Amino acid sequence: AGVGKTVLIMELINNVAKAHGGYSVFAGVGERTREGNDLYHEMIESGVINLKDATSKVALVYGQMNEPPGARARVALTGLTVAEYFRDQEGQDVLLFIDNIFRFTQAGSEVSALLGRIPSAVGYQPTLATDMGTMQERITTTKKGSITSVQAIYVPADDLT
Amino acid sequence: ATLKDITRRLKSIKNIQKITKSMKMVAAAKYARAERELKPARVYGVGSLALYEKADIKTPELIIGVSSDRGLCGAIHSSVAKQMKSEAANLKEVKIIGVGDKIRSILHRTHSDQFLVTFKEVGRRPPTFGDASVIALELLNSGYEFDEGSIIFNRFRSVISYKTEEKPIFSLDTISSAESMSIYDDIDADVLRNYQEYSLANIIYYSLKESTTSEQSARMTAMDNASKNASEMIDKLTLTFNRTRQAVITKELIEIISGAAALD
Amino acid sequence: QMSFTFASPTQVFFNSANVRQVDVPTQTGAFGILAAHVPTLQVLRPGLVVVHAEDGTTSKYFVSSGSVTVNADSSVQLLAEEAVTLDMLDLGAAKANLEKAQSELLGAADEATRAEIQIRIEANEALVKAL
Amino acid sequence: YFRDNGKHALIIYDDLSKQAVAYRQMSLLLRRPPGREAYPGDVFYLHSRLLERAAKMNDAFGGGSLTALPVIETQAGDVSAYIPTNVISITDGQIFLETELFYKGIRPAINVGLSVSRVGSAAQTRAM
Amino acid sequence: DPAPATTFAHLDATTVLSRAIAELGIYPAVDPLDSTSRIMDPNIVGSEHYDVARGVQKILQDYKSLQDIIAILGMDELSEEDKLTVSRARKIQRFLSQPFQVAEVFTGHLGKLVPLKETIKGFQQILAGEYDHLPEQAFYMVGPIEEAVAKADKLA
């Protein structure tokens, strides 16, 4: 984190999405409002966010840790939906920067219990996979463009297995 | 074992790992220095052997193990052990001096009874000439009936190689007087002895140093060895670990469901 | 010439160097062992090693003990127990030791005891000698 | 409140460990799904919302503060425990205290190596 | 797994394999320390068997202690005699390795069955350790040890 993790990301957005005129989405899922805040200005600061231009190469969606898990989770879909706009509609390579797909994951699982479900392994939603599949499968390269998904990955249990 | 236990394990395996590593580099540090230091020395002891080298003085007729006090981190002790037991029958004199008291292990029984002396604090700052002289000195004043002595030590050969040596000691100063050794001048059983003396240390020093070089390097190796080993295991366990780990969790959550929740 | 090995456990000064001469105070005596000696064994008196390399230069060292052994062949090996340059040898100590050395000697004992001093006296002196 | 009164507050939440216990306990009594590690999922949210409520604010708003010192007492290595994990995912850093060190007499205890302040320098005095 | 745990109650002789062993190639590959007939007894089985078995179980077990050690060390520190036994233990292992006819087909390696006495003798000999000098692989996959002896020579 924060190595200029973000700097890099910012930079990435810069490097390609400017260069190759693509677009970017940052869907700050479950993030610290603070961290989105920090980032915000950081983009502002970077000028990648321009406040004089809403063609700051990133559209931001944040669904910080204070919404229903699902809601925060669904900020993910939201971001997707937008990015879909830019791909298909804007014909583009949208970059979908996501932080954290994990937190999403946790969130899916979180509702499940309460959903009276039996959410499988690790407590994880049984549909963990389907959730994943369907979203991931939304991500691709259409003929219209690409949604290149750059997914920030939190290391649950410092493990990935 | 049960995951705890595994960890209990692990903990220490790492510790070990470290520890092994500690020695490894440490040994290597000692070593690192040590090899360099060998130069004048090497040469020097190699020097020591001058004379026989030339005018070779051999009779129809002691022994002395040399090593560290510390274990067989190679086959140091055992090697000499072997070959000295190999010896002991044959007649030299069965006097042994063990540099290294891990000499005094490998041979230690009637090598609680075939020694003249044995040396310790072998390392802990690599041996120096002083020592060689030291060990030389008291050696002199010894009830060797200075036959044909041997010094068996492990002459290091390279980082990865040593050779268990012997050299013979023309402790029979008279062979050292004899023969071809004649052309020699300053020939007095004085400078003779008084070279024998000097060379006893020289050689001693050297040999010893070789031994120790060997010791430090084999140890080095050993100390690596272990630490990779550790690693591997850590790998092995660690899975099994997790797996069980979560597995655990899982079950309880299982239990928690439908055992404590649905039906309890 | 001679492979002159001027070595000390710690220091090799010359290493099989084709040196013309080393003047060499074995306790045998001071001699000018020249390039390629006769089988001879020598005990090093403390003195100087005067290392006439084939170079005009003759190097000083003061030597404590050891052997030079001046071989059947042309190898000369000064195997110096310790042979050091006056450069690093402190007269301030040496003399000081030396007077003292005799002083201590005065309260010394047997052939040996006295010797410990005397040897030293001799030594230190021969350093003092040298410098 | 203080924060909003441009006033600078320090809350020490000591200890959410107990809180969680209670909350679960509560859930269960409510015969309500708890969650992971037998504890409710939105106990995270619980806390999240709680901690989201702590802040460093624009000054314009009095820009007070609510500085939060949550405490969790380890049972060791069970940071893995859901709530610590939670908290970890939330936190601004963690102060690992090393008891062993304490025993060594090293007081402060700190396992410094694992202690972290994610933030670092903004909270730092140039002096420092 | 409790289920097998239970199962055991109904057992009166068991062959507990060791896949662990199996992985080492081995056939037959066993958990020896629970490959049974409950009626393991010097009366029931002859004592020769029995004692030998107890000895075997012993050495192998001891060895079983030791790998772990060896692994966490080398085997060097560990008394060479033990090192010997260790080796023997493998030999015993290898000698336990018994290849079959039906799976000469698989193995490319002869099928074997061994009358007991020759067996008692077999292990007993290895226990007498005279053979020791001879390699593991001589011991591997045989019927009578004799053939193994043969194979050793042949190996040499």
PDB file of N, CA and C in Angstrom, chain D residues 1 3 6 15 23 28 32 36 51 61 67 83-84 86 98 102 115 120 124-125:
ATOM      1  N   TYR D   1     -18.803  15.248  18.030  1.00  0.00           N
ATOM      2  CA  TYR D   1     -19.216  16.473  18.517  1.00  0.00           C
ATOM      3  C   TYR D   1     -18.103  17.402  18.695  1.00  0.00           C
ATOM      4  N   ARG D   3     -15.214  17.213  17.454  1.00  0.00           N
ATOM      5  CA  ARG D   3     -14.609  17.355  16.191  1.00  0.00           C
ATOM      6  C   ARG D   3     -15.309  18.460  15.521  1.00  0.00           C
ATOM      7  N   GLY D   6     -14.686  21.865  16.440  1.00  0.00           N
ATOM      8  CA  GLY D   6     -13.341  22.195  16.081  1.00  0.00           C
ATOM      9  C   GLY D   6     -12.363  21.797  17.121  1.00  0.00           C
ATOM     10  N   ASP D  15     -12.375  -2.071  24.739  1.00  0.00           N
ATOM     11  CA  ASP D  15     -11.807  -2.861  23.693  1.00  0.00           C
ATOM     12  C   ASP D  15     -12.913  -3.454  22.941  1.00  0.00           C
ATOM     13  N   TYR D  23     -21.576  -8.393  20.957  1.00  0.00           N
ATOM     14  CA  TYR D  23     -22.406  -8.243  19.825  1.00  0.00           C
ATOM     15  C   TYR D  23     -22.825  -9.495  19.200  1.00  0.00           C
ATOM     16  N   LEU D  28     -26.888 -13.792  18.440  1.00  0.00           N
ATOM     17  CA  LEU D  28     -27.196 -15.146  18.604  1.00  0.00           C
ATOM     18  C   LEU D  28     -28.385 -15.217  19.402  1.00  0.00           C
ATOM     19  N   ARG D  32     -29.942 -14.603  15.224  1.00  0.00           N
ATOM     20  CA  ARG D  32     -29.685 -13.955  14.021  1.00  0.00           C
ATOM     21  C   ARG D  32     -28.398 -14.475  13.650  1.00  0.00           C
ATOM     22  N   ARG D  36     -18.661 -15.147  10.304  1.00  0.00           N
ATOM     23  CA  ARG D  36     -17.306 -15.589  10.265  1.00  0.00           C
ATOM     24  C   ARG D  36     -16.707 -15.601  11.592  1.00  0.00           C
ATOM     25  N   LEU D  51     -15.738   3.675  12.943  1.00  0.00           N
ATOM     26  CA  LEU D  51     -14.445   4.221  12.766  1.00  0.00           C
ATOM     27  C   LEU D  51     -14.429   5.212  11.695  1.00  0.00           C
ATOM     28  N   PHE D  61     -14.752  23.317   9.239  1.00  0.00           N
ATOM     29  CA  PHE D  61     -15.873  22.750   9.910  1.00  0.00           C
ATOM     30  C   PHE D  61     -15.542  22.757  11.352  1.00  0.00           C
ATOM     31  N   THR D  67      -9.759  11.372  17.240  1.00  0.00           N
ATOM     32  CA  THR D  67      -8.646  10.502  17.134  1.00  0.00           C
ATOM     33  C   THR D  67      -9.083   9.316  17.856  1.00  0.00           C
ATOM     34  N   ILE D  83     -12.259 -10.489  13.562  1.00  0.00           N
ATOM     35  CA  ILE D  83     -12.312  -9.129  13.931  1.00  0.00           C
ATOM     36  C   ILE D  83     -10.974  -8.549  13.882  1.00  0.00           C
ATOM     37  N   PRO D  84      -9.893  -9.064  14.347  1.00  0.00           N
ATOM     38  CA  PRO D  84      -8.661  -8.401  14.141  1.00  0.00           C
ATOM     39  C   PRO D  84      -8.387  -8.241  12.731  1.00  0.00           C
ATOM     40  N   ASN D  86     -10.380  -7.772  10.427  1.00  0.00           N
ATOM     41  CA  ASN D  86     -11.272  -6.727  10.059  1.00  0.00           C
ATOM     42  C   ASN D  86     -10.594  -5.488  10.268  1.00  0.00           C
ATOM     43  N   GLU D  98       5.243  -5.977  22.338  1.00  0.00           N
ATOM     44  CA  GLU D  98       5.921  -7.216  22.551  1.00  0.00           C
ATOM     45  C   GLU D  98       6.252  -7.448  23.967  1.00  0.00           C
ATOM     46  N   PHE D 102       8.950  -6.982  26.833  1.00  0.00           N
ATOM     47  CA  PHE D 102       8.651  -6.556  28.151  1.00  0.00           C
ATOM     48  C   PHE D 102       9.320  -7.411  29.158  1.00  0.00           C
ATOM     49  N   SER D 115       4.632  -3.495  14.398  1.00  0.00           N
ATOM     50  CA  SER D 115       3.945  -2.240  14.569  1.00  0.00           C
ATOM     51  C   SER D 115       4.110  -1.423  13.352  1.00  0.00           C
ATOM     52  N   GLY D 120       2.488   7.560   8.867  1.00  0.00           N
ATOM     53  CA  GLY D 120       3.845   7.994   9.046  1.00  0.00           C
ATOM     54  C   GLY D 120       3.981   9.494   9.212  1.00  0.00           C
ATOM     55  N   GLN D 124       3.801  13.423  11.859  1.00  0.00           N
ATOM     56  CA  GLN D 124       5.105  13.462  12.411  1.00  0.00           C
ATOM     57  C   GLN D 124       5.452  14.873  12.420  1.00  0.00           C
ATOM     58  N   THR D 125       6.325  15.195  13.376  1.00  0.00           N
ATOM     59  CA  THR D 125       6.871  16.475  13.611  1.00  0.00           C
ATOM     60  C   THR D 125       8.118  16.428  12.870  1.00  0.00           C
TER      61      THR D 125
END
